[PDB]
Swiss-Prot record, chain A:
Function: Subunit gamma, of the mitochondrial membrane ATP synthase complex (F(1)F(0) ATP synthase or Complex V) that produces ATP from ADP in the presence of a proton gradient across the membrane which is generated by electron transport complexes of the respiratory chain. ATP synthase complex consist of a soluble F(1) head domain - the catalytic core - and a membrane F(1) domain - the membrane proton channel. These two domains are linked by a central stalk rotating inside the F(1) region and a stationary peripheral stalk.
Subunit structure as annotated in this protein's UniProt entry: Component of the ATP synthase complex composed at least of ATP5F1A/subunit alpha, ATP5F1B/subunit beta, ATP5MC1/subunit c (homooctomer), MT-ATP6/subunit a, MT-ATP8/subunit 8, ATP5ME/subunit e, ATP5MF/subunit f, ATP5MG/subunit g, ATP5MK/subunit k, ATP5MJ/subunit j, ATP5F1C/subunit gamma, ATP5F1D/subunit delta, ATP5F1E/subunit epsilon, ATP5PF/subunit F6, ATP5PB/subunit b, ATP5PD/subunit d, ATP5PO/subunit OSCP.
Source organism superkingdom: Eukaryota
Encoding gene, per UniProt annotation: ATP5F1C
Residues of the full protein shown: 245 to 297 of 298
Protein name (record): ATP synthase F(1) complex subunit gamma, mitochondrial
Native organism taxonomy: Eukaryota, Metazoa, Chordata, Craniata, Vertebrata
N6-succinyllysine: residues carrying this PTM: K26
From Swiss-Prot, chain B:
Organism: Bos taurus (Bovine)
Protein name as it appears in the record: ATP synthase F(1) complex subunit alpha, mitochondrial
BP GO terms, sorted: proton motive force-driven ATP synthesis
Record note on modification: Acetylated on lysine residues. BLOC1S1 is required for acetylation.
Residues modified as Omega-N-methylarginine: R160
Gene name per UniProt: ATP5F1A
Residues making up the signal peptide according to the UniProt record: none
Organism lineage string: Eukaryota, Metazoa, Chordata, Craniata, Vertebrata
InterPro entries: ATP_synth_asu-like_sf, ATP_synth_asu_C, ATP_synth_asu_C_sf, ATP_synth_F1_a_nt-bd_dom, ATP_synth_F1_asu, ATPase_a/bsu_AS, ATPase_F1/V1/A1_a/bsu_N, ATPase_F1/V1/A1_a/bsu_N_sf
Family matches, as CDD domains: ATP-synt_F1_alpha_C (cd18113), ATP-synt_F1_alpha_N (cd18116), F1-ATPase_alpha_CD (cd01132)
Site (Required for activity): S369
Tissue: Heart muscle (at protein level). Heart and liver.
Swiss-Prot record, chain C:
Gene name tied to this protein: ATP5IF1
Gene Ontology molecular function, alphabetical: angiostatin binding; ATPase binding; ATPase inhibitor activity; calmodulin binding; identical protein binding; protein homodimerization activity; structural molecule activity
Effect upon mutating K17A: No effect on F(1)F(o)-ATP synthase-binding
Protein name: ATPase inhibitor, mitochondrial
The keyword Manganese is annotated on this UniProt entry: no
Site annotation Participates in pH sensing: residues: E19, H42
A cellular component annotation (GO) from this entry: protein-containing complex
Native source species: Bos taurus (Bovine)
Residues included from the entire protein: 33 to 79 of 109
Region (Disordered): 1-20
Compartments (UniProt record): Mitochondrion
UniProtKB/Swiss-Prot annotation, chain D:
GO CC field: mitochondrial inner membrane; mitochondrion; proton-transporting ATP synthase complex
Positions carrying Phosphoserine: S357, S375
Subcellular location: Mitochondrion inner membrane
Function: Catalytic subunit beta, of the mitochondrial membrane ATP synthase complex (F(1)F(0) ATP synthase or Complex V) that produces ATP from ADP in the presence of a proton gradient across the membrane which is generated by electron transport complexes of the respiratory chain. ATP synthase complex consist of a soluble F(1) head domain - the catalytic core - and a membrane F(1) domain - the membrane proton channel. These two domains are linked by a central stalk rotating inside the F(1) region and a stationary peripheral stalk.
Designated name of the protein: ATP synthase F(1) complex catalytic subunit beta, mitochondrial
GO BP annotations listed: proton motive force-driven ATP synthesis; proton motive force-driven mitochondrial ATP synthesis
Positions bound to phosphate: G151, V152, G153, K154, T155
Enzyme class per UniProt: translocase
Enzyme Commission number(s) from the entry: 7.1.2.2
Length: 53, 501, 47, 469, 486
């Protein structure tokens, strides 16, 4: 049962790492999305402010 | 700049010398008829921020000023405006009738009723141009104010003249919070202490006609609306209109509280005020900022908030109280309104709509509210109970996510938090609140399951009232630590809880 | 970029909430331990 | 000449003056207004009307309003004589006591310390503060930035530190409520009355009152920077006394010049500030400090509104803050009181050549230990103290204890904090540090070290717990 | 009236100088105003020229008839300021007076071409262990310095200078070099400490003062890049190896930003305009060695990079990376984790190259860096620590030993060969039994033992620059005595 336990923990961590990479995938996707989003957002803000001038 | 009269509209009479007759002090032609952004031919001798009266009766608020052209405000839906129109500038800082004849009368900031209750019966017209209170005029104030909700009075004691700021977003019971305060402010205003009898102010900005009528049904049902001032800036409230509605409240508070009225103003939301002033500045083509919003909203909104003074002995002795309620964008603390209030407020309340999302109704954002006012305006009995209650609820939260003795502590704290809950539209006197506070400080039902306590709390309030309503009024009037009422409470607690099973 | 030490705890999400709660549980176990030891030491110093 | 109201949306006004535009820093009074309305000529636009910085409410003005041209910045008396009342930068004594007239009167626009003539040393201006001494001891007359937020203890820790030090200022002193609450104004007036370092009726005023309140618009609220610089120069020479200076708050102040820039049509910075808003603020930081005949133990509040740690405003703040006071509002959320950002604030008196090898080394080891605390905290969040290693569980307990021993409830705080203040001795602090390094309460609960003064006092508190258990 | 080489202030505000006249005046010249304000204009309007107030022009009222002196930016040249504290306006810095520098070099200095460049081979005096270890700076190198508030950036600089000033006070024929480093955007107290220590560290012996104060004029901040460029070129075309330190760099960026902003020039990203490439790289690309034809001098540059919350995507940083022949990543948490030096090593990088690398120190670093990466390769595993694979455990201990050696001492430059020797002892495995908490004091004590005794062998290796297996063994035995006897 102890070998079962150690192997189970290993495989569990494995599945966990799989799920982690998966989450991180879309996480980074939206992350760059929001990164560029805020970048260009401030950009457009400045652009309009220039337009205001 | 675009030569406004560089056209023969005035230039013809200029080269022909025919323009000389123009009323050039507080009247004239419209130097610019457009978008309600009003420039007036002449009237350069008009006061700044003065009143302008169109020949069509429409009111003008000349803020921007070319030499004779101006930026004035179309105080109305001007679908009939005409070129070169005549605005007889009234030349005055905006004022409108004031007096508690409005308290119990639903009129607008200019004294305009929408419900058909009659012309503004409020006595005298007050120019809202009110500055900050004086160091001699102002002093520390620590008198209690009507809170009426268990945790509300408990941790964020309500000070007579304290300026609240209650963080709670869209559909977070913010309106429900105001109604709860009013029901609490009812029994206080429904009291013979003219300090307690509050002819006070409460408003919800952007209260559409349906919202207005519903709120009116509620407030009249409360009958505290009789001793209350309630204006509802409906869906068409003008940017100048909604913009100075807080200034209307400022002038009204000077009127009553500066005459010693221990009274409260509830206006929200100044974020919508930002939208309105920004709409103006856009129409004004004025330099925009964050969210296009002006960065000078600081001092502009400070004109209302930063002048927070509870009428001291020099100011009549009442209270010019405020009760802001903040509404997060997405928890966007750094939102222009949000960051500003954070940058502005010295003390603020926060509601956890996530606990309301968790289902808690009410669901105040525990800890997230700030009461730098402290318990100095709560019952010293309530203050004593809260001294323990703070740590109790903290530990209940501190390890909420499950020692056995620590497990006992957590069970007691969770049950206490459950007990502190309140229903929907159920504000009352803090007497039963302090009663349950004594119950918890004794843990009078911490053995009763919170689900058992769910009804046991109601049964406890009931059996105490049927047992010590006299002792309730006793501890009330006495206020101080009533060891005799404390033992009576221990007995009636054995009665209510022990007799409940 | 870089990853902080306690970066999740720095973020302190539900994971960080668990961090806090488990700190509560384990530190409270150790606290009962230290308190019991102190009670024993007080008992010892009584004589 | 004499300017005349021409065309303006409010204070952004070029007033028609018969001659040209006065020299720079010109501040002229509006003749024909409700009150004495001094407006600062600021835009060399010419046209015999310079778009001028009016600090007052423009309402009621009629175009053509002929105003009194002065030609320079506001002149009011200074020196330790004006101490005792509360006066405006225009000199307006708002202490309801009329002009508290002093001797040294001059304009405010001036230069910074000389490239060879200032003070060139740093002396630890110790005050015995638990956390501050523990890690980041301050120094004499430097640019110490108080990185704290709104309602974030900045005024609370300010009250504690005022109670601590202000009663015993080296000479006279100054305090500015720059956009402080008017309620806070009256409360601070009552507090000064009850404080004695400045006495309202009595001439015990080792302090100077100043107000730049939030209900006061930026035109004044943004302008008191030069007033403070001049007051610091006076305490250097004219008031001529070893003076610490209080001024709060500057976030709304630099933001106030920012809001002004729009009327100036001045370029919005990253936070929309004036492009040279930084230029002034850095120059504002360069005016008056410790020098040969200069000395300003000025306390600078670094407001981080919206908790934006990397704020461009915080950027300029860190840019000249010779001393750093990094709050950890998260710590306060964790109940810390003190609650500073420990491994974040920088102070020169924390150095082996300065703090001594022992003290600086101890502080650095504390920083490392807390860093491990954070690191392993998430590690536990994964696993937990079930796997707590011998070095680790030990480290966990020790770090918890360090955090506990960090804070203390003050007597002014005892109003809310209940526990009155503990005058932390420096040697006591270092000794508690060494003992904790040894583990002075291994069998005991760290909660005693929490909100505590001396480590021995904490041992006593733990014994009291043993009683109460 | 004047319309050729003198203008008259048309309309101003915040020093926005656009005068009427001097239309025929040349472009980009620092000319005296009607208030005599020697200042430069760039925005030559069709009707006027946008002139930058070279500082504060409060002594200039509107309408002023500015006489276009036709004088371009010219700044002194020659090592007369080496050790002397001077300001870029011909003024002193610490009030250190006339450096005995007479000339002034017009702004007309261009960067060297490929032919005018020289191959870089100088191993830089870095005074920080890993600095020289992982990657020193070539003869005229170009490495970024990423850092944050009070990040020790100037402290790493002090280690370098202390390693540098010895030969700056010294004469080593290949080490003869010129030194100038900016304290840009510096508080008065900071600059005073800088001058005082330069005296104290004797760095005020051969260093030409560079700094921009917090009160330094934004135009002054802008010219400071050009100022340092000309100053370096002085000794660089004078065959003397020279050093620049754009410290800081972002401040002048915000400066020119505010400048063009007043000028109503287009902002660009973060209001930063293209000059972040154009003006900034205009000085940046010159970070090289003036050819033997160009004098044989080396133009080193040490720009300072503020990590605004690690603003890794700063358009400033953006240009920097595309320009960086090197960068200084700092694991500041490590200093916060006690490890000061807080080396962000796997993060750190340098593209200058190893043509200036001591093949002895190169040999040391070849294994040191591989071991460091391998430790870093599984350093996550160190967290659990337990059941460490023997290879993994040994790799960790080597990394653990290095972490013990990872720290650095403020204002504490040392012999580079000393670090080479320490790393060599590690390579011997001769440190495998030293407890890391004490292994640091160990290495220090062994260092003392050598610097007394093997100081002979130390100079032997140093002048040798060649690792004699016998000399290697002699140092090994000296160290073995020092350490076994530690």
């Amino acid at each position: 049962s102890t070998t079962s336990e150690q192997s189970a923990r290993m495989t569990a961590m494995d599945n966990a790492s799989k799920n982690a990479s998966e989450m991180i995938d879309k996480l980074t996707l939206t992350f760059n999305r929001t990164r560029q989003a805020v970048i260009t957002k401030e950009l457009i803000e400045i652009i309009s402010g220039a337009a205001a001038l | 700049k675009t030569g406004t009269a560089e056209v023969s509209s005035i230039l013809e009479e200029r080269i022909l010398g025919a323009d000389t007759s123009v009323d050039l002090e507080e009247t004239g032609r419209v130097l610019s008829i457009g978008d309600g952004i009003a420039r007036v031919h002449g009237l350069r001798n008009v006061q700044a921020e003065e009143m302008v009266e169109f020949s069509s009766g429409l009111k003008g608020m000349s803020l921007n000023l070319e030499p004779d052209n101006v930026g004035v405000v179309v105080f109305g839906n001007d679908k009939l405006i005409k070129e070169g129109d005549i605005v007889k500038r009234t030349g005055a800082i905006v004022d409108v009738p004031v007096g508690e004849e409005l308290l119990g009368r639903v009129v607008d900031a200019l004294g305009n009723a929408i419900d058909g209750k009659g012309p503004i019966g409020s006595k005298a017209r007050r120019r809202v141009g009110l500055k900050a209170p004086g160091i001699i005029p102002r002093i520390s104030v620590r008198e209690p104010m009507q809170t009426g909700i268990k945790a509300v009075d408990s941790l964020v004691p309500i000070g007579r003249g304290q300026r609240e700021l209650i963080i709670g977003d869209r559909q977070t019971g913010k309106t429900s919070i105001a109604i709860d305060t009013i029901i609490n402010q009812k029994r206080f205003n429904d009291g013979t202490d003219e300090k307690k009898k509050l002819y006070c102010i409460y408003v919800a900005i952007g209260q559409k006609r349906s919202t207005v009528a519903q709120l009116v049904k509620r407030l009249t049902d409360a009958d505290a609306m009789k001793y209350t001032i309630v204006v509802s800036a409906t869906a068409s409230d003008a940017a100048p209109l909604q913009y100075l509605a807080p200034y209307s409240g400022c002038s009204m508070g000077e009127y009553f509280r500066d005459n010693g009225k221990h009274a409260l103003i509830i206006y929200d939301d100044l974020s919508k005020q930002a939208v309105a002033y920004r709409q103006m500045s856009l129409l004004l083509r004025r330099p925009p900022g964050r969210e296009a919003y002006p960065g000078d909203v600081f001092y502009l909104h400070s004109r209302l908030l930063e002048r927070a003074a509870k009428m001291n002995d020099a100011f009549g002795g009442g209270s010019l109280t405020a009760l802001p309620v903040i509404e997060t964008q997405a928890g966007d603390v750094s939102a222009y309104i949000p960051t500003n209030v954070i940058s502005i407020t010295d003390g603020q309340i926060f509601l956890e709509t996530e606990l309301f999302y968790k289902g808690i109704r009410p669901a105040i954002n525990v800890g997230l509210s700030v009461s730098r006012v402290g318990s100095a305006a709560q019952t010293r009995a309530m203050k004593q109970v809260a001294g323990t209650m703070k740590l109790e609820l903290a530990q209940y939260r501190e390890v909420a996510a499950f020692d056995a003795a620590t497990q006992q502590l957590l069970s007691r704290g969770v049950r206490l938090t459950e007990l502190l809950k309140q229903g929907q539209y159920s504000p009352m006197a803090i007497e039963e609140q302090v009663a349950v506070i004594y119950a918890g400080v004794r843990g009078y039902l911490d053995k009763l399951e919170p689900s058992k306590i769910t009804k046991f709390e109601n049964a406890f309030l009931s059996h105490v009232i049927s047992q010590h309503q006299a002792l309730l009024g006793k501890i009330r009037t006495d206020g101080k630590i009533s060891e005799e009422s404390d033992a009576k409470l221990k007995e009636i607690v054995t009665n209510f809880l022990a007799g409940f099973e | 970029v870089r990853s902080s030490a306690g970066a999740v705890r720095d973020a302190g999400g539900a994971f960080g909430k668990r961090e806090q709660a488990e700190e509560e549980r384990y530190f409270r176990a150790r606290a009962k331990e230290q308190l019991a030891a102190l009670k024993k030491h007080h008992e010892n110093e009584i004589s | 000449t004499t300017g005349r109201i021409v065309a303006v949306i409010g204070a952004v006004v070029d007033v028609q003056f018969d001659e040209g535009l006065p020299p720079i820093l010109n501040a002229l009074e509006v003749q024909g207004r409700e009150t004495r309305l001094v407006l600062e000529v600021a835009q060399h636009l010419g046209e015999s009307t310079v778009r001028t910085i009016a600090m007052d409410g423009t309402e009621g003005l009629v175009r053509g309003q002929k105003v009194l041209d002065s030609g320079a910045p506001i002149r009011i008396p200074v020196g330790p004589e004006t101490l005792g009342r509360i006066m405006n930068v225009i000199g307006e004594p708002i202490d309801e006591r009329g002009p508290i007239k002093t001797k040294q009167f001059a304009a405010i626009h001036a230069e910074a310390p000389e490239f060879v003539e200032m003070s060139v040393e740093q002396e630890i201006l110790v005050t015995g503060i638990k956390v501050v001494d523990l890690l980041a001891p301050y120094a004499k007359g430097g640019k110490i930035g108080l990185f704290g937020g709104a309602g974030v203890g900045k005024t609370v820790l300010i009250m504690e530190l005022i109670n601590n030090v202000a009663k015993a200022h080296g000479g006279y002193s100054v305090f500015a409520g720059v956009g402080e609450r008017t309620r806070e104004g009256n409360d601070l007036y009552h507090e000064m009355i009850e404080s004695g370092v400045i006495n309202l009726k009595d001439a015990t005023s080792k302090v100077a009152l100043v107000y730049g309140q939030m209900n006061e618009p930026p035109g004044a609220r943004a302008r008191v920077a030069l007033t403070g610089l001049t007051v610091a120069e006076y305490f250097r020479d004219q008031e001529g006394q070893d003076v610490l200076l209080f001024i709060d708050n500057i976030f709304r102040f630099t933001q106030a010049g920012s809001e002004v820039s729009a009327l100036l049509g001045r370029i919005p910075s990253a936070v929309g500030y004036q492009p040279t808003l930084a230029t002034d603020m850095g120059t504002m930081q360069e005016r008056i400090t410790t020098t040969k005949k200069g000395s300003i133990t000025s306390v600078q509040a670094i407001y981080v509104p919206a908790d934006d740690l990397t704020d461009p405003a915080p950027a300029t703040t860190f840019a000249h803050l010779d001393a750093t006071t990094v709050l950890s509002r998260a710590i306060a959320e964790l109940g810390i009181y003190p609650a500073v950002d420990p491994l974040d604030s920088t102070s020169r008196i924390m150095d082996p050549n300065i703090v001594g090898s022992e003290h600086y080394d101890v502080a650095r080891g504390v920083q490392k230990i807390l860093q491990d605390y954070k690191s392993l905290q998430d590690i536990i969040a994964i696993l937990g103290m079930d796997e707590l290693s011998e070095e680790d569980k030990l480290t966990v307990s020790r770090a918890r204890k360090i955090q506990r021993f960090l804070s203390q409830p003050f007597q002014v705080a005892e109003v809310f904090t209940g526990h009155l203040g503990k005058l932390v001795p420096l040697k006591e602090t270092i000794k508690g540090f060494q003992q904790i390094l040894a583990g002075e309460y291994d069998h005991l609960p760290e909660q005693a070290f929490y909100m505590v003064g001396p480590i021995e006092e904490a041992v006593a508190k733990a014994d009291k717990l043993a009683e109460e258990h």
